[PDB]
């Protein structure tokens, strides 16, 4: 997903997903300790810096190749042979974040948590779970798609407090892997012969530009909503693990 604005949801789907996930935790009145949301907000600047930094600097964006932002659950690889993938990377910052939290280093903690949330967010994007980059055919579709998502994301907010609590085990990799599995299953709802053909025609036809956007909307809504629920559960897991319990 997009992350073009550091502290604004406008063109930052990653921040939006995290924010909606936190909202889920807030709406939940039976399992969530609200002081957890209080901390996320207290250190929001760092959390957002972490979410944003993933796509703009090393080592996080892998020399502008973003290889660590992809993870195919079937072969466990990213799109570049031998490169680090989203599962191991998301887990990496999840742990570094927890370790800093225990050491009472809150800025360090939430910055790293932000990065981890970013990687978890990416595997919820079908293209990232299928190694479909902006260079994959049709090239350019990846970026155009994620930019489009920003114009409609607000129409798919989860409004209940039902996040996927304890969706997977205690290992963050299980959550990242699990999300990628579901995302990859929805891949054809975004990338198929139709959307490919229409996107190519969108170059010269406004009708086709609207046609591919329309076609991918239903699945986009599904992906966005699941991403919110999974992320909420992931955050809850983080606090349960390192929040002194
Ligand atoms: Zn992204
Ligand atoms: Zn992307
Ligand atoms: Zn990314």
Domains of the chain: 1-245 (1.10.575.10)
> Does the annotation place 118 within a ligand binding site?
yes
For residue 1, give every residue at least 6 positions away whose Cβ sits within 8 Å of its Cβ, in sequence order, or none. Answer: 13, 14, 17, 121, 122, 124, 125, 146, 149
CA distance 171 to 167: 11
CA distance 164 to 233: 5
> Does the annotation place 177 within a ligand binding site?
no
236-240 own/partner pairs: CB under 8 Å, 24+ apart: 236/25, 236/31, 236/32, 236/36, 236/163, 236/165, 236/166, 237/166, 237/170, 237/172, 237/175, 238/94, 238/97, 238/98, 238/113, 238/116, 238/172, 239/33, 239/36
- CA–centroid distance, 54 to ligand 1, in Å, is 9
CB neighbour burial string for 195-221, b if at least 16 within 10 angstroms, e if fewer: beebbbebeeeeebbebbbebbbebbe
- CA–centroid distance, 141 to ligand 3, in Å, is 16
Handedness of CA 184, 17, 96, 167 (dihedral sign): negative
| Local structure of residue 75 (DSSP, 8 states) | T
Q: To 5 degrees, how large is the angle CA 67–CA 72–CA 75?
A: 110
CA distance 192 to 32: 40
- CA–centroid distance, 118 to ligand 1, in Å, is 7
Catalytic residue numbers, as ranges: 14, 55, 69, 118, 122, 128, 142, 146
Ligand nearest, relative to CA of residue 133: 2
CA distance 236 to 36: 8
> Does the annotation place 7 within a ligand binding site?
no
Other CB atoms within a 10 A radius of the CB of residue 75 amount to 9
- CA–centroid distance, 122 to ligand 2, in Å, is 7
> Does the annotation place 210 within a ligand binding site?
no
Structure-determination technique: X-ray
- CA–centroid distance, 245 to ligand 3, in Å, is 31
> Does the annotation place 193 within a ligand binding site?
no
CA-wise closest residue to 67 among 77, 52, 57: 77
CA-wise closest residue to 17 among 52, 45, 46: 52
Residues 101 and 116: beta-carbon distance below 8 Å: no
For residue 146, give every residue at least 6 positions away whose Cβ sits within 8 Å of its Cβ, in sequence order, or none. Answer: 1, 2, 13, 125
């Amino acid at each position: 997903w997009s992350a073009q604005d550091k502290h604004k949801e406008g063109v930052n789907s990653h921040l939006w997903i995290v924010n909606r996930a936190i909202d889920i935790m807030s709406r939940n009145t039976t399992l969530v300790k609200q002081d957890r949301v209080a901390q996320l907000n207290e250190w929001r600047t760092e959390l957002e810096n972490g979410i944003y930094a993933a796509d703009y600097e090393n080592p996080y964006y892998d020399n502008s190749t973003f290889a660590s932002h992809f993870y195919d659950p079937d072969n466990g690889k990213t799109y570049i042979p031998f490169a680090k993938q989203a599962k191991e990377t998301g887990a990496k910052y999840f742990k570094l974040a927890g370790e800093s939290y225990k050491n009472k280093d809150m800025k360090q903690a939430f910055f790293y948590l932000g990065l981890s949330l970013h990687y978890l967010g990416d595997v919820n994007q079908p293209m990232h779970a299928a190694n479909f980059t902006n260079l994959s055919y049709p090239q350019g579709f990846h970026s155009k798609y994620e930019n489009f998502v920003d114009t409609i994301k607000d129409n798919y907010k989860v409004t209940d407090g039902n996040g996927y609590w304890n969706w997977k085990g205690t290992n963050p990799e299980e959550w990242i892997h699990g999300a990628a599995v579901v995302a990859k299953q929805d891949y054809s709802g975004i990338v198929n012969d139709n959307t490919k053909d229409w996107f190519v025609k969108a170059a010269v036809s406004q009708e086709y530009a609207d046609k591919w956007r329309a076609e991918v909307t239903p699945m986009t809504g599904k992906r966005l909503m699941d991403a919110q629920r999974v992320t909420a559960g992931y955050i809850q897991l983080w606090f349960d693990t390192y929040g002194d319990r």
